[PDB]
């Protein structure tokens, strides 16, 4: 590669691996998104919330593939694993799955930052910090707040709570 400089084979492969993880998370969010528009679930605000996240994850993998080209790495694609569940249950369940998925992406991001730091690759480190890290922290905080409000709305009165949350917090 005529352009490749300070770009380790380890980062390259771990970037490809993070790309597969983003593709998979996107796929998960697509499934959550359509799930909540089923006639027998019908929570459009929740559907929208998840569709948006599918879309932000695709931007993630796209930005990771562009950066691969820019550093002169070579993208390598693997199969994308189907989402972990076929039905997602109620809003609090789905939001807890989404939380767990974002924590795993965040950990993979922190892991890739540590690797790049170890291979003294400050371009890769700051690319991750300016385009991925701050955004994860903001999104996880939002999901925590959502979970707190779903819980304050739970207990016996749960169906009503789910309706109110979708109507008064989520965007439709």
How many C-beta atoms surround the C-beta of residue 35 within 10 A? 20
Q: Which contacts (CB < 8 Å, 24+ apart) does range 47-53 have?
A: 48/170, 48/171, 48/172, 49/170, 49/171, 50/94, 50/98, 53/29, 53/98, 53/139
Binding residues for Fe cation: 52, 55-56, 59, 62
Residues from 80 through 99 that contact Fe ion (CB under 5 A): 86
Asked if 139 and 102 touch (Cβ cutoff 8 Å), the reply is: yes
Map tokens 């369940």 to a residue. 93
Beta carbon of residue 168, minimum distance to a second copy (angstroms, whole number) = 5
Q: Within positions 65 to 94, which residues make up the interface with a second copy, using CB under 8 A?
A: 65-66, 68-72, 74-83, 86
- Using rule CB under 5 A, residue 125 touches Fe ion: yes
Binding residue for ligand [O] (CB under 6 A) from 6, 52, 87, 157?
Answer: 52
Q: How many residues bind a second copy (CB under 8 A)?
A: 82
Helix (H, G, I), strand (E, B) or coil at 62: helix
Residues with Cβ within 8 Å of 32's Cβ and at least 6 positions away in sequence, in order, are 50, 53, 54, 83, 88, 94, 97, 98
Binding of a second copy by 34 (CB under 8 A): yes
For residue 157, the minimal CB distance to a second copy (Å) is 6
Nearest to Fe ion of 10, 135 (CB atom): 135
Alpha carbon 29 to chain centroid, angstroms: 8
Tokens 């070579």 label which residue?
Answer: 74
Min CB(38)–a second copy separation in Å: 6
- How many C-beta neighbours within 10 Å does residue 34 have? 14
**Interacting residues with a second copy between 44 and 63 (CB under 8 A):** 44
Which of Fe ion, a second copy, ligand [O], none does residue 76 bind to, with CB < 5 to 8 Å depending on kind? a second copy
Q: Which residues bind Fe ion (CB under 5 A)?
A: 37, 44, 47, 55-56, 86, 125-126, 129, 135
Q: Which residues bind ligand [O] (CB under 6 A)?
A: 37, 44, 52, 55-56, 59
């Amino acid at each position: 590669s005529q352009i490749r400089q300070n770009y380790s084979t380890d980062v390259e492969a771990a970037v490809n691996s993070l790309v597969n993880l983003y593709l998979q998370a996107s796929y998960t969010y697509l499934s959550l998104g359509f799930y909540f528009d089923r006639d027998d679930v019908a929570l459009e605000g929740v559907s929208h919330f998840f569709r948006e996240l599918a879309e932000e994850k695709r931007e993630g993998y796209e930005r990771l593939l562009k950066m691969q080209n820019q550093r002169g790495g070579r993208a390598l694609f693997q199969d994308i694993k189907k989402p972990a569940e076929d039905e997602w249950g109620k809003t609090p369940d789905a939001m807890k799955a989404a939380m767990a998925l974002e924590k795993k992406l965040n950990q993979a991001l922190l892991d890739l930052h540590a690797l790049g730091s170890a291979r003294t690759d400050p371009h890769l480190c700051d690319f991750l910090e300016t385009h991925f890290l701050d955004e994860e922290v903001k999104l996880i905080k939002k999901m925590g707040d959502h979970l707190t409000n779903l819980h304050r709305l739970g207990g016996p009165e749960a169906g009503l709570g789910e309706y109110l949350f979708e109507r008064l917090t989520l965007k439709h």
